[PDB]
Amino acid sequence: GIGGVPGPHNGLTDVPGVRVGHAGRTGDGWLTGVTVVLAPPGGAVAAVDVRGGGPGTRETDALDPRNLVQTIDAVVLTGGSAFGLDAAGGVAAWLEEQGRGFPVGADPSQVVPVVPAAALFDLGRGGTWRARPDAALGRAAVEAAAARPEGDPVEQGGVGAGTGAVVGGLKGGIGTASVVLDSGATVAALAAVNAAGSAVDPATGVLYGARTGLPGEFAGYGVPDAIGADTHARARARLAEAAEETARRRATTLAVVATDATLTRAQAQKLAGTAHDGLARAVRPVHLLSDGDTVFALSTGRRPLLPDRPDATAARAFGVHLEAGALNEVLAAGADVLTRAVVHAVLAATGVDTPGGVHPSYRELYA
Template sequence: MIVNSPPQSLLGSVVDVPGLLVGHFTLSERLTGCSVVLSPQGAVGAVDVRGAAPGTRETDLLDPANLVDKVHAVVLSGGSAFGLDAATGVVRWLDEQGIGFETGYGRVPIVPAAVLFDLPVVRAGDDPQARPGAEAGYAACQAATTTPPAAGNVGAGAGACVGKLFGLDRCMKGGIGNASVRVGPWVVGALVACNAVGDVIDPNTGQVLAGARTVDGKDLLNTHRALLAGERGSRPLPGTNTTIGVVATNATLTKAQAKRLAMSAHDGLARSIRPAHTTLDGDTLFALATGTEAGQVDLMLLTVMAAEATAMATVDAIRQARGVTTQTGRIPNADDLTNTA
C-alpha cells in the first residue's frame, strides 16, 4: 500500500507561484503514479530536454517558433511510455472545466508530459502490469490544490530510484521533491521527480546523499569517483532512468525567455546529480510563467533562481523518500545509510 501522510517539503514548492495547483495520484497496486501541475488560466510554457533517452508528449509545440504559447497543465508520470496516457485524463478533466486553447470550434487543453521508468520496482503482492493511465491523470487533477504538495514516495516519484549504474540491487530510493526561491517580487518554484542513473549530491557540501552502494550494500560508492577510477557498471538500458520536473515563475515571460528558464534549471540538476544528462537518462524540465507579476523582468536573476530551486527540489526528493522492500530486496533511502563516500 502507499505510504500514509507523506511528508511535505519545508523548502517551499512550485505552488508558491500564484496561478498554479499541484496534485498527485499514487497507485495502490504498485509503486508508481503521476503528478500534475495545473495552470487553469494558462501559463507561457517551454521545455528543455538534456537526457538522451526522453519519454515525452506535446513538447514540439513549446518551441518558441511555434504557435501555441500557453499550456494548461504539465504531467509528470511513472510507468515509462505507458505513463504518457495519464495526460489523456488531464485533458479530459480540463475539458470538463472548459479550460483550453480557443480554436473557434471548442477549447483544446494543452498538456505536455514527461515520464520516468519505474517498472522494476515491484513489491510482493503488487500487480506488475499496473501503470498510471488516464484515470490516474484525472484523479491527480481532482486532488490538485494550492496546498504545498507531498514529497517522497508519491505521484511520479513513487517508484523512482537513483544510483543504478552498478545494478538495481545496489540502488537507493528516489522520489519527488519541492522547493521555491523568493527575491523581491519574484518567485521561482520547482517540482522534481528524481529517478537518475547517477548519485544525488548536496550541492552545498558535496556530500553524496543517495546513489550506488558498495557491493555489500552497506555504504555509498560514489559513482562519479568510481567511473573516473576505471570501474564500470552493469550498463542499464537507455531510458530506464530519468529526472523530470517543472520550474515555474510568477514573472511575465515570452516563450523564448521561458526556454532560458528551463535551460538554466538544468544547471540545478547538474549541481545535484552526478553524473547528470547521461545517455541513459531522459532528463526533461518544463518551464511555466504565470505572469501574475508584471514588473520588468530580470532574466539573469530568474535563471539563477531557477537553478537554485531545481537543485533544492532534487535534494528534497531524496531527503523525503522512504525505503521500500521489493521482490528482489530492500531499496534503502538516504537515512538508511551513513555516507562514507
C-alpha cells in the same frame, strides 16, 4: 532585503495560483504514479527543455516559441516509461470538461488542451511488469490538484510520479523548493527524482546538492553534515547489496520550474535550459542515454520582470541592461531551486522493499 529566502512553504505552490496533484498505486504489484502541475485559470506561459538522451514525451513541439499555443493549463509527470504517457489523455479529458484549452470554435466549450507530458522508467518496481499509469490515474492526479487551495504545501517523498522513483539505487521521490528574489518574484521547482546517476558523493556520502541549500532548510530531516568514514563505508556496502538483491529479484529526473515573473515563451525556454544546470549540480552523471531528464518552465505572468524606477543596485548585464539583468536573476534562481528540490526529494524519501526492488532511503543509510 526580502530575497534569498524560501517562499512560505518552500515549494512550487509558493508561486501563487499554481497547484500540484499526485495520484499513485502502491501494493498488490504496483509502485508508480503521476504528478500534475496545474496552472491557474487562464493558463501559464510554458516552455520545455528535454536534455536526457532517452526521453519519453508528449506535446513538446507545441511548446516551441515559434508555435501557436503559448499558454497551457497543465503539465504531466508520470512513471511507467513511455506507456505512462497514456496518463496525459486523462488530464486532457478533465481539462476539456472544465472548458480549459486552446479555443478552436465560436462555442466556448470547443477547446483543445495542449497537455505536455514526460515519463520516467520505473517498470516492474512494484513486482508487476504491466502495472503502469493510465488515463484514469492521470485524471485522478489533476482532480487532486484542482481540489487544493492556493499556496498549499506540496507533498514530498514517495507520491505521484515519485512513487516508484529510484536515484542511483537509493529511493528517490518528489521534492520541491522555492526562493524569493529581491524584486519580490518567486521562483520554485518541483522534481520527480529517478536518476541513473548518484545524488551522493561516492568519496564522502555527502549529497552533491546540499552546498546549494539556504541556511537551515534541510534541518527538518536530521542528518549530520559531518559524515563518518565508517558510516559512509557501511552505507556503500548496504546500497551495494540492495543493488545485488534488486538484480536477482528482477532476474531520469522530471521537473517543473515556475515563477510569477512575467516571461515570454523564449525566456521560459531559456529558464528550462538553465534549470538543467541545477540538476547537474545535484546529480552526477546526468543527461545520459539512460536518462529522460526534462524540465518544463511556467510563468504565471503576474509580476512585471522589472519594477518602475530601478536603483543603482538593480542588476544590469554589462552594467547597462536592466531587463537582461533581471532575467539573469530568474535564470540563476531556476538552477538553484532545482538543485535544492533534488536534495529535498532524496531527504524526503522512505525506503521500499517489494518483489521488484529493494531501495533504502538516504536517511536510512546516513541518518
